[PDB]
Scaffold this active site. Structure first.
Site, PDB file in Angstrom:
ATOM      1  N   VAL A  17      38.806  87.882  27.150  1.00 23.12           N
ATOM      2  CA  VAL A  17      37.924  86.844  27.757  1.00 23.12           C
ATOM      3  C   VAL A  17      36.511  87.082  27.223  1.00 23.12           C
ATOM      4  CG1 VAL A  17      39.363  86.478  29.799  1.00 23.12           C
ATOM      5  CG2 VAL A  17      37.575  88.194  29.891  1.00 23.12           C
ATOM      6  N   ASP A 117      47.324  87.539  42.278  1.00 21.82           N
ATOM      7  CA  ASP A 117      46.480  88.726  41.969  1.00 21.82           C
ATOM      8  C   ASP A 117      45.062  88.523  42.522  1.00 21.82           C
ATOM      9  OD1 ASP A 117      46.038  90.750  38.878  1.00 21.82           O
ATOM     10  OD2 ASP A 117      46.085  91.377  41.011  1.00 21.82           O
TER      11      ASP A 117
HETATM   12  C1  LIG Z   1      40.674  82.806  33.039  1.00 21.43           C
HETATM   13  N1  LIG Z   1      39.262  83.075  33.311  1.00 21.43           N
HETATM   14  C2  LIG Z   1      38.501  83.571  32.163  1.00 21.43           C
HETATM   15  C3  LIG Z   1      38.686  82.859  34.506  1.00 21.43           C
HETATM   16  O1  LIG Z   1      39.375  82.475  35.449  1.00 21.43           O
HETATM   17  C4  LIG Z   1      37.258  83.092  34.733  1.00 21.43           C
HETATM   18  C5  LIG Z   1      36.179  82.208  34.751  1.00 21.43           C
HETATM   19  C6  LIG Z   1      35.008  82.978  34.940  1.00 21.43           C
HETATM   20  C7  LIG Z   1      33.645  82.706  35.061  1.00 21.43           C
HETATM   21  N2  LIG Z   1      32.783  83.696  35.268  1.00 21.43           N
HETATM   22  C8  LIG Z   1      33.262  84.962  35.343  1.00 21.43           C
HETATM   23  N3  LIG Z   1      32.362  85.945  35.524  1.00 21.43           N
HETATM   24  C9  LIG Z   1      32.697  87.349  35.348  1.00 21.43           C
HETATM   25  C10 LIG Z   1      33.011  87.974  36.692  1.00 21.43           C
HETATM   26  C11 LIG Z   1      33.096  89.493  36.574  1.00 21.43           C
HETATM   27  C12 LIG Z   1      31.745  90.068  36.201  1.00 21.43           C
HETATM   28  N4  LIG Z   1      31.920  91.203  35.242  1.00 21.43           N
HETATM   29  C13 LIG Z   1      30.829  89.015  35.605  1.00 21.43           C
HETATM   30  C14 LIG Z   1      31.590  88.104  34.643  1.00 21.43           C
HETATM   31  N5  LIG Z   1      34.557  85.334  35.237  1.00 21.43           N
HETATM   32  C15 LIG Z   1      35.404  84.314  35.036  1.00 21.43           C
HETATM   33  N6  LIG Z   1      36.774  84.377  34.895  1.00 21.43           N
HETATM   34  C16 LIG Z   1      37.620  85.581  34.905  1.00 21.43           C
HETATM   35  C17 LIG Z   1      37.186  86.647  33.885  1.00 21.43           C
HETATM   36  C18 LIG Z   1      37.532  87.954  34.538  1.00 21.43           C
HETATM   37  C19 LIG Z   1      37.188  87.724  35.973  1.00 21.43           C
HETATM   38  C20 LIG Z   1      37.650  86.312  36.259  1.00 21.43           C
END
Ligand SMILES: CN(C)C(=O)c1cc2cnc(N[C@H]3CC[C@H](N)CC3)nc2n1C1CCCC1
Length: 260
Positions: A17, A117
């Site tokens: 990601v 999850d």
């Molecule tokens: C399938 N994806 C990519 C998503 O559902 C998705 C959209 C997001 C939009 N912003 C964020 N922010 C992160 C949260 C954690 C912190 N380190 C700051 C960055 N994570 C997103 N995610 C996932 C990535 C992993 C956690 C959830």
């Protein structure tokens, strides 16, 4: 290219990601996940859920044909909990953040989607203090897993309300409740607190018998979660019911006296 990769958020579990720049839309931060027909149906469901634009799920901006483009939120629940000033989270903030959570969960449950999850690391907190759900609908930490998932018995929507109970507790304590190194250890930790269920509540046709767990009573919850309300206690218990069937639903929970 419409996107410039600037950072790797992490995960790497299903895939890598990235945090990028939407060059065509004012250089806003986006989250990219670059990734058969069972996956094609997984993305059709996501595109479908985007049509209702629920405020309490992360927005899906595009599907390039394969990369998925989400809005980026700088912050998650763990980081909010890390940086929340002692004495910690105001109880009214807990109530609202929870309310936003069940609203998102009910939306998903209503359309027969299970997160599977639900942890604080895929719960996003927007700068406006809004709760957004992420990292669901696409196929390490067992601390939020339902007993049925651990026992490999059932993987239905009740799983996500077990996780919510676990998270609800973590909003007072600011420390996880059940920290197991494995599925059986996890199961051990749970039954230490909520106690041994009756044999009728133990799923049939499963590897692990109720008899692999001893002397498990039923510790009062106030001991593990302090400065919790009576109404919060009531709600926490109905969420952390061992039997998925006797466990409360998101819809049913959104009406609980705790929220009034
Ligand atoms: C399938 N994806 C990519 C998503 O559902 C998705 C959209 C997001 C939009 N912003 C964020 N922010 C992160 C949260 C954690 C912190 N380190 C700051 C960055 N994570 C997103 N995610 C996932 C990535 C992993 C956690 C959830």
């Amino acid at each position: 290219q419409q996107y410039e990769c600037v950072a790797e958020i992490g995960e790497g579990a299903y895939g890598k990601v990235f945090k990028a720049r939407d060059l065509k839309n004012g250089g806003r931060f986006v989250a990219l996940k670059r990734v058969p027909l069972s996956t094609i149906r997984e993305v059709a469901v996501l595109r479908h859920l985007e049509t209702f634009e629920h405020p309490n799920v992360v927005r899906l901006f595009d599907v390039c044909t394969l990369t998925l483009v989400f809005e980026h939120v700088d912050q998650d629940l763990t980081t909010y909990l890390d940086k929340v000033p002692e004495p910690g989270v105001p109880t009214e903030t807990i109530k609202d953040m929870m309310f936003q959570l069940l609203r998102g969960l009910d939306f998903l449950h209503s359309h027969r989607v299970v997160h599977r999850d639900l942890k604080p690391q895929n719960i996003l907190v927007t700068s406006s203090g809004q709760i957004k759900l992420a990292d669901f609908g696409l196929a390490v930490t067992l601390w939020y897993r339902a007993p049925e998932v651990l026992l490999q018995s059932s993987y239905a929507t009740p799983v996500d309300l077990w996780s919510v109970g676990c998270i609800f507790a973590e909003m007072f304590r600011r420390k996880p409740l059940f920290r197991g190194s494995s599925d059986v250890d996890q199961l051990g930790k749970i039954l230490d607190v909520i106690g041994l269920p009756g044999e009728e509540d133990w799923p049939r046709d499963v590897a692990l018998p109720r008899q692999a767990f001893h002397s498990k009573s039923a510790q009062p919850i106030e001991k593990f979660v302090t400065d919790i309300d009576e109404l919060g206690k009531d709600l926490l218990l109905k969420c952390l019911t061992f039997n998925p069937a006797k466990r409360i639903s998101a819809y049913s929970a959104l009406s609980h006296p705790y929220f009034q």
